[model samples]
Target: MLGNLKPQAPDKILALMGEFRADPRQGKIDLGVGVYKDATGHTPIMRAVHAAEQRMLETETTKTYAGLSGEPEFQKAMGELILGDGLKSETTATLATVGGTGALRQALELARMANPDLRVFVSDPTWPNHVSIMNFMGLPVQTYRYFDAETRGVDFEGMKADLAAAKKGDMVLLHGCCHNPTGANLTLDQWAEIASILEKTGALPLIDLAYQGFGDGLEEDAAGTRLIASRIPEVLIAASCSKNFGIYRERTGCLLALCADAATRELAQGAMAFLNRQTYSFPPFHGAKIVSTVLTTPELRADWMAELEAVRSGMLRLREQLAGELRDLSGSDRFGFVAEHRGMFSRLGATPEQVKRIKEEFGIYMVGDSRINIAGLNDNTIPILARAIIEVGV
Candidate 1:
């Protein structure tokens, strides 16, 4: 069986990390992976997470399983976090999964089981993993234009035009906030229009909310999703605690399916639990326990929120600095979109050759598609990257 298996294509992001590690050059910056790093270039553990774990160490006694769907406390807390206080219990069902990727996979599986003919429409330059997972499942997938290369903003008109063609029962995948790889996001007005479009087309919305606090404020980030859930009869939400909670290694995430009625909700809940049993049996406990502890405790929750805010503000500062540096160098506001974009990533819209020249000429490492992790740069490295961008004539 091992001999029969074929070699898989290398993951570009992971490969870049390897190359970065192997490089002997000094002052080499890695802006490849989507992980967050502070100004000192360290992915430090948040204070709240440390406190939660310390508490769990003394309080948690058992090594028993958390059942198929995992901890109820985690589900409740995560549901509240993602859907807000108005989340309807009668219409919603949530399941703890390995991570955001796990939630996405299970959601897709559930969608396929319900309607195998269901077609999925994804953003043109969505997270590569989205496309990879969908294709791996042999599911039909289509692309709707999202990122506008000229403006480095959302192509709302093009997206609306593409999604207008979707038939009833089709699934439209949306980046709930902090769009990956591109970082351009839809405004509240645009989200309202999208909700209206989905309503007319009778298509279901699958929202991937990976980086909530990393974008706008927590409530502000969830505004679009809340509007969709309220307007649409049904929806699927896949949320991650990895980014916000700083529990990437713990692999914490949840998949929520909102049904039109109580009966449908019950059915959806059972299906989600069944899928969990078939895949990972039980989700990891440490991350979920830590999240629940932090969320439920007043002091810990407040501390976590403050730390998250600082992180968000830090990224925003880097974005402004980089954009300003570029503007100053080029004597134009062409790169001003960098400051406009939110989250950890922004596609520089550089050609593959320019990307190669950047890596070769300078030690600045970004993805082939020109997606740079904004968190990867520090106060000192920002000027270096800016100089390289202009020197390469990108």
Candidate 2:
């Protein structure tokens, strides 16, 4: 069996990381991976996370297994965090998963179990893993136009047209906020329109909310999701705690399945817990406990919010500075979309050849499609990257 295994294609982001590390060049910048890095190029633990861990160390008594759905406190806390105050638990069922990726997988599985004929519609240039996972699961997936190459913004008209093709019972995957790969996001108004369309089509929404606090304020980032949940009878949400909570290695995430009514909600709850038992049996406890502890404790939650705001503002500053530097270099506002795009990434719309040239000549590493991680830049390297973009004619 081991010898029969075939070669697998390398993941572009991970492969880029490998190449970036092997390069012996000085001043090499890595904007390939999606992980957030501070000015010092380090992904630090949040103060709240550290405090929560210390408290847990002192308080936690045993290594006993949490239920299949994990701790109820964690579930309730995450539900409140994502859905805001006055969460309607009667209509919602949540399961703690290994991470955002696991949540996504479980959500898809649940959807398929409900509607075996379910067709998934995704953004044209969504996170590569989305397409890969859907295909691996033998699910039929379609792409709707999302990013406009010329403006580097959302092509709302095209998106609307494509999603109109989706029929009832189809699962339309949406980025709740902070679209990955390309940082361009849907405005609240656009989100409203999408909700209206989905309502009309009778299609269910599966929202991937990985970067809740990274794009905008916590409440603001969740506004779109809240609106949709309020409007739709049923929806699925896959939320991640890695970015905002700075607990990537902790593998913290949750999957929420909101049903049309309390009866359906109870059924969905049982199905989700059963899925967990079939998959990993039980979710990891440390990350979920840390999150619940932080959110429940006022001081720790405040400290976490403060640090998250700092990270958000820092990324915004980088965006503004980079867009400004590019404008100064090219004497054009064509690159203005960089500043407008929220979140950690911006697709600069560079050609494959141009991207390769920048990497080889300027020691700047970005994705093949010119997607750069804004958190990878610092005050000093912003200018270097801007000059490289102009030099490479991107």
Candidate 3:
């Protein structure tokens, strides 16, 4: 019965990790994976996370199972972190999941259960996992033009045009902030326009919020998501603590459902709980506990926020330095979009051949789609990458 299964395709970003390790280059820059790295190329555990773990070591007593939705404190902390102070309890329901990926999977499953024929609309070049997961689940998927290659920015008109053709009850997936594989993001005004489109088309918004504090300030990053959640009668939010909390291996995330009233929220909450029971009975506890500890305490929360802001500002500085270097070397404003883009990644928008040339000739490893992780570079390598880009005649 288990003999005829086809081999699955390798994860491109993860596959690069092996290739990068095997490379004998002295100073190879790895900008492939979505993980955040410091200037020294280390994904260090946050100090707040360490402190929480130390406290838990002394306080945690038993390994008893948390409920299907995980601990109540985890949910409350996540609700406050994602929704801030104005969260409406009656309209929202939250559940802990394995990670952002798990939350996304559960959210899609819930959508499929609600409408078996629901088709999900994705960005033209979304993170490959989204498309792969949809295909794995046998759900219909559609693409809407999002990034404009020429401008290296969002194609708002094109996105609106594609979304306008979506039918009622369909799900539209949106990046909460710092769009992956492409750092371009929409303005708050643009987010308002997107909410209008969703309202007119009756399409449910499924927002994937992985890098909450990585792009802009915490509140600034969540501003657009908050607007959508408040305006839409129904919305699905998949929030990740991995990037923001620096706990990738801990697999911490939450799935939130926003409904019209308490009754609908309760129904959705039950479905979410059922979804957890069907998949992984109870989510892990360590990560959630750490997050809850940090968020619930005033001092720890402030320290975490301060560190996150420093990381955010550092990435922005990298973007500015890279763009400035490119401008100086090429004597053109072609790469000016780098500064305007927020997030750890920005697609250079180079051709496939140019991408290959970069990897082969310069020992610089960006994604095949030309997406470079800004956090991967430092004060020295930024100029090296800029020189490589100009040398390749990109």
Candidate 4:
């Protein structure tokens, strides 16, 4: 069976990480992966998380299983953190999953289980893993217009038109904020329009919230999701603690299903539990516990929010600096979209050839589609990248 397996395609981001590591250039830059890095080009653990871990170590606990759905406290904390204030008791049910990726997988599975004919519609240029996962599950997937190459912004008109084609019972996947690959996001009014469409079409909306605090502030980034959650009769949310909490390896994430009422909510919860049992019986607990501690403890939560704010502002500063540098070099405001895009990435709208040229010539590693991780650049490398962009006439 193993010998009959075919060779799988490589992950662009992770594969690029290897090339970047092997490059011996003195000033080589890596803007490939989505992981958050500080000004020093290091993915540091958040202070709150470190403190929480120390506390957990001191408290001492058995290694007993946390059941199929994991700890209820963790679920409650995550629901409140993502949904805010309350869990919409009448319509919401949550389960702790392995990570954001796991939550996404479980969500797609749940949709297929409910409506075997369910089709998943994704952004035209979403995270590669998203498309790969859907295909692996043998689910029908489609794309809606999202990015505008010329402006490097969301093509709202085209997106609305494509999304309108979705029929009832289909699952429309949306990035809660800070759209991956293309950082451009939907405005509040646009979100309202999407909600209206979902209401009209009776389609289910699944929100992938992997970069909440990494984009706008916590609440600000969650605005679109909050609006959808309140208006829609049913919504699926997969939130990750990887970026915001800097707990990548711990694999912390949650899957939330919002149904019509308590009866439906209970049924959804049961389904989630079954899914967990079928997949990995018990999920990791350390990262979830750390997240819960900060969320529940006033002081820790405050500190975590403060640090997250700083991280958000830092990325914004980098965006402004890069755009400013580009403007100064190219003598044009065409690159102004960089400053406008929030999050760790901004799709430069460059062709694959241009991207390859930049990487090969200047050792500046970015995704093949020119998606640059904003956090990947610092003050020292910003000018280098700006000069490279100008040299390539991008």
Clashing pairs in 2: none
List lDDT for all candidates, in order.
Answer: 0.92, 0.93, 0.91, 0.90
Count of clashing pairs, candidate 2: 0
Looking at model 2, residue 356 earns an lDDT score of 94
Q: What stretches of model 3 exceed 4 Å from their correct place? A: none
Reference-based TM-score of each model? 0.98, 0.98, 0.98, 0.97
Lowest-sum lDDT 10-residue window in model 4 = 9-18
Model 4 ranges off by over 4 Å: 12-14
The best-first sequence of candidates by lDDT reads 2, 1, 3, 4
Q: Top lDDT: which candidate number? A: 2
Q: Tens digit of lDDT per residue, candidate 3, span 1-394?
A: 6678888777665678888999999988887767888877789998888999999999989988867898989998899888898688888899999999999999999999999999999998898899989999999999999999999999999999999988889999999999998999999999999999999999999999999998878999999999998888999999999999999999999999989899988999999999999887899889999999999988889999999999999999888999999999999999999999998888999998998899899999988899988888888898899999999988
Model 2 error, position 232 (Å):
0.7
What's the lDDT for candidate 4?
0.90
lDDT of 4 at 357: 90
lDDT of 1 at 89: 91
Superposed by TM-score, candidate 1 places the C-alpha of residue 52 at a distance from the truth, in angstroms, of 0.7
lDDT agreement of model 1 with the native = 0.92
* Candidate 1 Cα outliers beyond 4 Å, as residue runs: none
How does residue 264 of candidate 3 score in lDDT?
89
Q: What is the lDDT of residue 57 in candidate 1?
A: 89
Instruction: List, residue by residue over 82-174, the lDDT tens digit for candidate 1.
Output: 888879999999999999999999999999999989899999899989999999999999999999988999999999999999999999999
Which wins on lDDT, candidate 1 or candidate 4?
1
